[PDB]
Each structure stands twice: as structure tokens, then as C-alpha cells.
């Protein structure tokens, strides 16, 4: 997730349709997003690390969220009215197939819908950011730098410590 | 000795007062300005047809830098480093050593054309007319690195522009 990402911007742009369609209301999906600067610093460190020759790393964020909680927090940081409604899997797939027809960059695809609803894997046997000397930045410290663009003029100056960070399903 | 620019007093007779009233109510001076613009409309414009027509220049024009040779083909530069010393912008970098035949010649001669102020001091300082500012001025590039000249580029510029540089020097060396 970052300024030019397709993760936070993707959910923030769903306000144009009026509601947020989520499969199973997003209560059966768990996400662990990671900050862009952390990934880039990890790449540079892996270049500069001689022990990372044949290794395989897994870059994950510090907190795990339910999809419903994550999207609710996203809409709260952007100060937009949150209208979540459940959409069945086949209907969402049909919507994605319809959007796939764009000759330009599609707004969404069936594969994108599949990947959004799929929970992040837990791979504790792989090295992570911490093994390269990186402390992963939580979403609650960098969400405003992405979602402040999506606010209206009335809420443009609101500070980051106003939107009450969300609940994490951790352990 | 001084003069006044705004120290006149208008007449107060009926004739001049009526002329001023006519000027106020019928806009005489505005019509005169319109007439001046109309006169300018019908003159020939001063525009020239660049790039097919060029602006006038002189043999003293200071354009792109170049390194010159003697008629035998030997380089004129003998690495005295006076151009480097005199350069107000520290745009010239020089390294030299004895050549294989024992000549005093440079191994590195660079001019940073993004540091250069094009003052012509280097060609004044040169005692053998080795470094000159040529007549070329149309050498804009697309990258910054293309404006960092080394010895090969300057020698190529000299070989390219010698036919004009020699004639320009012949017409002006008696003033120097």
C-alpha cells in the first residue's frame, strides 16, 4: 500500500458506486498489507546482504485485519460514508467479467476480485522484513498520506490521530 | 542645468476652454492613439524568417568552444593551463604529460559547458590561439551529459569549424 498503490486507492474509489460490495460482508477474509518503503528498503538490504543469496523472503505488515474492519477504517480515514453490503461470489465474478472488457486499464477484473477476497497466508518458516533490519510501518501511521487525497474540502485538514485505529485479529 | 517636465499652466480663455471641453467630451487624444496604432499596422514588420534567415553577427561573436591545429595537423595546445587559471567559472579541467615523441601535450581537456559563462577569457589567455570560441550557437542537446565536453569532442569541433574560425580570426586579429 502506498500513494500510487492499487490497494487503498482501489477501496477508496468504490465510493463512486454508492456502496461497498463485499463477499460474505468481508467477515471471512484477513489481510496483512505492507508499506511500500518497507518493501523497497528490504530489496536494497537484500542486495547488500551476502547471506540472502539463495534465500526466500516474505514481506508482511505488522498487523492482520479483517477485510470489513480494514475497509471501514479506510472509509473513516477518508471521512466518507460507509455503506457495506454483501454481494454473492458469482455476482461479483459477473461484475468483474463485465469490467474486464475495457481496452484500457480495467477498473477491476475477475482475478482482482478473487485476490481481494482471499486471506493472506501465514508463513512463519520464511524470513521477513525484520531479518533484513526493517521495522515494518503500521498502516495507522501512513494511511493518511494516501487517503487525504480522497477527502472533501471540509475534512482536508483533519489530523491523523482523529480516526481511532481499527481492530486487529492478531493471534 | 535642469528643466521642468510637468510645470505648465493652461490658458483660461473661452477658446482654449472650449477646446479642452471638446477633448473631454469627444475623446481627441484617444483617437490620436488609435491613429498611431493604425499607422503602425500598415508598416512592414521587422520579423525575419528563421531558420531560413539568420540574425546578423560579427567576427567577435563568442559561441561554441573549439581546439585548433597548425597547418601541418599538429595541435596548437601546449598545456600551459592559462585558460584553466583564468576561467571565472572553473569550467576547464586539464591534465598533461610528455607525449611518446616528447611533446608537451594534454591527456585531458574538458570544458563544462553548463558551468561556462562564455566570457571568452580563455581565448584571450591562450598564447598560441589553440582554444577559441567559435561562431556556432545552435548546439542545444537533450541531456545534461551531452554538454560535458572532453578533448575528443573539442578537437572534432575544431576540425569541423576550422574553415570559418580561421577566416573569423583573420578579420579580427589586428584588433587584438
Amino acid at each position: 500500500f502506498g500513494r500510487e498503490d492499487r490497494f487503498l486507492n482501489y477501496f477508496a474509489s468504490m465510493r463512486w458506486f454508492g456502496g461497498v460490495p463485499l463477499i460474505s460482508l468481508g467477515k471471512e477474509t484477513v489481510k496483512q498489507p505492507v508499506y511500500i518503503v518497507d518493501v523497497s528498503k528490504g530489496i536494497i538490504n537484500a542486495i547488500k546482504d551476502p547471506d540472502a543469496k539463495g534465500k526466500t523472503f516474505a514481506f508482511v505488515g505488522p498487523n492482520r485485519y479483517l477485510l470489513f474492519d480494514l475497509v471501514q477504517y479506510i472509509f473513516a480515514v477518508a471521512y466518507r460514508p460507509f455503506l457495506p453490503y454483501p454481494l454473492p461470489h458469482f455476482a461479483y465474478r459477473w461484475v468483474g467479467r463485465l469490467f474486464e472488457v475495457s481496452p484500457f486499464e480495467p477498473w477491476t477484473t475477475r482475478d482482482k476480485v478473487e485476490r481481494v477476497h482471499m486471506s493472506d497466508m501465514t508463513l512463519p518458516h520464511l524470513p521477513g522484513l525484520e531479518d533484513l533490519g526493517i521495522q515494518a510501518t503500521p498502516l495507522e501511521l501512513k494511511a493518511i498520506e494516501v487517503l487525504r487525497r480522497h477527502r472533501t474540502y471540509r475534512w482536508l485538514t483533519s489530523e491523523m490521530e482523529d480516526v481511532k485505529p481499527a481492530k486487529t485479529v492478531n493471534i | 542645468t535642469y528643466k521642468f517636465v510637468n510645470m505648465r499652466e493652461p490658458s483660461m480663455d473661452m477658446k482654449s476652454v472650449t477646446d479642452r471641453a471638446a477633448q473631454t467630451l469627444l475623446w481627441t487624444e484617444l483617437v490620436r492613439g488609435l491613429g498611431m496604432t493604425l499607422s503602425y499596422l500598415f508598416r512592414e514588420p521587422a520579423t525575419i524568417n528563421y531558420p531560413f534567415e539568420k540574425g546578423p553577427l560579427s567576427p567577435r561573436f563568442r559561441g561554441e568552444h573549439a581546439l585548433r591545429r597548425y597547418p601541418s595537423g599538429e595541435e596548437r595546445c601546449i598545456a600551459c593551463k592559462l585558460c584553466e587559471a583564468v576561467c571565472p567559472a572553473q569550467a576547464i579541467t586539464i591534465e598533461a604529460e610528455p607525449r611518446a615523441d616528447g611533446s608537451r601535450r594534454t591527456t585531458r581537456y574538458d570544458i563544462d559547458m553548463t558551468k561556462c559563462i562564455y566570457c571568452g577569457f580563455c581565448q584571450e589567455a591562450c598564447p598560441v590561439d589553440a582554444i577559441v570560441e567559435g561562431p556556432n550557437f545552435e548546439f542545444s542537446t537533450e541531456t545534461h551529459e551531452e554538454l560535458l565536453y572532453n578533448k575528443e569532442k573539442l578537437l572534432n569541433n575544431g576540425d569541423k569549424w576550422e574553415a570559418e574560425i580561421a577566416a573569423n580570426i583573420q578579420a579580427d586579429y589586428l584588433y587584438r
Binding site: - | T114, K115, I117, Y118
Partner: protein, 156 residues
């Protein structure tokens, strides 16, 4: 192929439209702006090429950095470059903008405007003559003539 021909023709049309109407921002810094004015003067008449000054950044296509860029001004120059709608182009004109020039080693001078904004054309001189800047603008037009946006989009 038909589509290749159509995208080539459309790219040619859009390139001609963009390079035949270039509007530089009313923006100058130092001595080189005087030569910019002389390029706007009757002798060279940049407006006869379709080149028109406009004050607002939102109504500008080209930005000509004509003068020394200092550290106090770099935020404002970057701000007005960012507020230009795309496509946009930058012309670095003169030694000061190209690499610092006479003030390269100063404590308050940015050593080239390309440390702040990307540059398309570098016009050398201190100052470059009005004809030199005109040559730079025509070179920028020739560079715009060579863009392949729709062909590359089709090739994706």
C-alpha cells in the same frame, strides 16, 4: 494492419496539435528572461510559431527555466511545475539553470534545475541568444513530433 495505420495517423495528428500550440508559462528568474523577452520581440516573434505566454500554470504546456534557481525558490518552482496539467515539458535555458553556471559553487544555488524537475531540452549559453532559444524550442517541437503514445498503447 488497419489498427496500426489508424493509431499511427492519430498519433501524428495529436503530435502535430501538441507541437503546433505550445504555451510557455509566464515565468522568469534572471538575465535569461531578457533574452526570452527578445525572443518574444518583433524580430523573432515566437507567437508566429504558435508559442504564446500564459500566466496561469493550469493553462501552460511548457516551462522555461530562464535564470538561476536558488534554494529559497526551489519549493515554489516545484509547486508551479506540479500544478501544470499533463502533458508538460521543461526547457532549461542558460548555464545557471543547466548546471549552476557562474554560481555553481555557491551555498544558496541549486546546481541545475534538473535536480528539481525533469528537463527535456538544455539550451547552452550565458545568456543564450534569442536565436539559440528559438533553436531549442524548435528542437523541442521536433522531439514532440517523434512521440509514439498510441502506437505503444496498441502494442501493449
Amino acid at each position: 494492419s488497419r489498427g496500426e495505420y489508424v493509431v499511427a495517423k492519430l498519433d501524428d495528428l495529436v503530435n502535430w496539435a501538441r507541437r503546433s500550440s505550445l504555451w510557455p508559462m509566464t515565468f522568469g528568474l534572471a538575465c535569461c528572461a531578457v533574452e526570452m523577452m527578445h525572443m518574444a520581440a518583433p524580430r523573432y516573434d515566437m507567437d508566429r510559431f504558435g508559442v504564446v505566454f500564459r500566466a496561469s500554470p493550469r493553462q501552460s504546456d511548457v516551462m522555461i527555466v530562464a535564470g538561476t534557481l536558488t534554494n529559497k525558490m526551489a519549493p515554489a518552482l516545484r509547486k508551479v511545475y506540479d500544478q501544470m496539467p499533463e502533458p508538460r515539458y521543461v526547457v532549461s535555458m542558460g548555464s545557471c539553470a543547466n548546471g549552476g553556471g557562474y554560481y555553481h559553487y555557491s551555498y544558496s544555488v541549486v546546481r541545475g534545475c534538473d535536480r528539481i524537475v525533469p528537463v527535456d531540452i538544455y539550451v547552452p549559453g550565458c545568456p543564450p541568444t534569442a536565436e539559440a532559444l528559438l533553436y531549442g524550442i524548435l528542437q523541442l517541437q521536433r522531439k514532440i513530433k517523434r512521440e509514439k503514445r498510441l502506437r505503444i498503447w496498441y502494442r501493449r
